[PDB]
Symmetry: D2
Subunit: 95 residues, 4 copies
């Protein structure tokens, strides 16, 4: 019992920050952003496979989604060249 | 049915964009960022409750954590005011 | 001087990471996200002041904007409470 | 003068949201994230060009930085394969 409510706050925080303190530490985090009308890449692939005739298997639906990205019909919410099923997308200008 | 691999891409996309198309759309996104030594507010509360003497129940370790936030000993990864156990934090300057 | 294209990469990097190396390091990052139809709080205030009759000075159009935020007519792109003219917003549901 | 402080708030907001309302609208936004010890790709290239002997011009310094990324000695804060001078980075595990 070396720390208590009477120890100065700064010292308790440097204790918590030390290697092997026991504090569960992360090198990743997730942030929520409010964006109207965003969608997952996997959901797009699902929609195509179920509603567009002529895909022999789900693989070809992924290739078609990647085509939509290339053409600017859908857009990455943060700019990467590669289509990925875990990233989020929005529609392009469809006017 | 109405759409195939022969339909033009722009029209397939405008069908996917229409109301009631069945595409899962949401007003939010989740973004993964690499940030070394970040931690959940709930993991700060748990650490305090188990390593610092004099909290009669867990509620009191949450109030202490808020106090660390106010003092700048820990910092929100996106400037907010209220301490929340579901958000991610980093250490402030301790030197 | 001490480092060249013949030095091992890991050692060059540890030198760059040392205190007083001269590398510009900061406690913040800026991230660019594609989000259709977003807008600055200052541009909402300006719009209101110029298009809506009965604001004796600009301060009163800022208070009206806060009122839109409270009602959910506009939304913060990252859930905060306070209206700020330097942040970005989107439209809520209006139907 | 068709809108005023006496018009219902919802209607003023749908006015502001209409095409050609005059409201300045964005398809991009910038978010600030607090991350200890982050740095710009361009700053890294500068540091190398000025402190590591054997670069005939700044171009070769960019190629070397891209090598550090590939080797995991520096890391992207959001995961892309390409090194870019406008993105932000953090150090890898240098233990």
């Amino acid at each position: 019992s070396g720390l208590s409510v009477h120890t100065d706050m700064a010292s308790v925080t440097k204790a918590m920050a030390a290697p092997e303190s026991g504090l569960e530490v992360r090198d990743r985090m997730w942030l929520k952003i409010t964006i109207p009308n965003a969608f997952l890449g996997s959901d797009v692939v699902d929609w195509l496979y179920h509603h567009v005739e002529g895909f022999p298997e789900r693989r070809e639906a992924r290739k078609y989604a990647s085509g939509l990205l290339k053409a600017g019909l859908i857009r990455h919410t943060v700019n990467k060249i590669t289509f990925s099923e875990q990233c989020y997308y929005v529609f392009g200008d469809l006017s």
